[PDB]
Amino acid sequence: ELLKPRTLADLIRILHELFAGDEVNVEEVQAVLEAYESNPAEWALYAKFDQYRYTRNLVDQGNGKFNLMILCWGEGHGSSIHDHTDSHAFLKLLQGNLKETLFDWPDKKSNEMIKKSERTLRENQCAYINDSIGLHRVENVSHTEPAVSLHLYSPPFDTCHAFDQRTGHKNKVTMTFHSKFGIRTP
Ligand SMILES: [Cl-]
Ligand SMILES: [Fe+3]
């Protein structure tokens, strides 16, 4: 029985219930993420920015079932085109707007990766992706507003692939945390 998360802490408690088992009801998870109304005071601890690129700030380890993290995007900061390592990936905006561009998996032949679509994700909206859907790039294209998003990945993963838009060629990337549980982790 899905109830509205009253706070980020409450959201986390609900997520632990939704991930108690071995499978994932994606629509329920997305619905509860969407229902949490971003409250900046509740996540200020995790919202640690870097001047040069977006940061990943671990919030909860989901009793091993998922990683929940907050990503902080300076003006003009964005990601690679990337996959999600056979995991579910949820993205909820907590502040600002992000542009999500979708791409299909490349063929073996070297070719320009053509965007299949794009959307603007707005405050409190939740998006979902997995490798069966395709690849994406996420970007804060704003010149004036930093963005903050809440990401849930299940199972957790710390490696993924970045794709070269010019060729479709992929490279393995290890993902790093800027902080964990509010503590900067050089
Ligand atoms: Cl993502
Ligand atoms: Fe992603």
Curated annotation (Swiss-Prot):
Source organism per UniProt: Rattus norvegicus (Rat)
Binding site for Fe cation: 82, 84, 136
Cross-link 3'-(S-cysteinyl)-tyrosine (Cys-Tyr) mapped to chain: 89-153
Job of this protein: Catalyzes the oxidation of cysteine to cysteine sulfinic acid with addition of molecular dioxygen.
Family to which this protein belongs: Belongs to the cysteine dioxygenase family.
EC number: 1.13.11.20
A Pfam family assignment: CDO_I
UniProt note on tissues of expression: Highest levels in liver. Significant expression also in kidney, lung and brain.
A Gene Ontology biological process term: response to azide
Cofactor note text: Binds 1 Fe cation per subunit. Ni(2+) and Zn(2+) can be used to a lesser extent.
Keyword Iron: yes
Catalytic activity: L-cysteine + O2 = 3-sulfino-L-alanine + H(+)
Stored InterPro entries: CDO_1, RmlC-like_jellyroll, RmlC_Cupin_sf
Gene Ontology molecular-function annotations: cysteine dioxygenase activity; ferrous iron binding; nickel cation binding; zinc ion binding
Protein name: Cysteine dioxygenase type 1
Reported induction: By increase of sulfur amino acid intake.
GO cellular component annotations of the record: cytosol
Alphabetically ordered keywords of this record: Dioxygenase, Iron, Metal-binding, Oxidoreductase, Thioether bond
Domain of life: Eukaryota
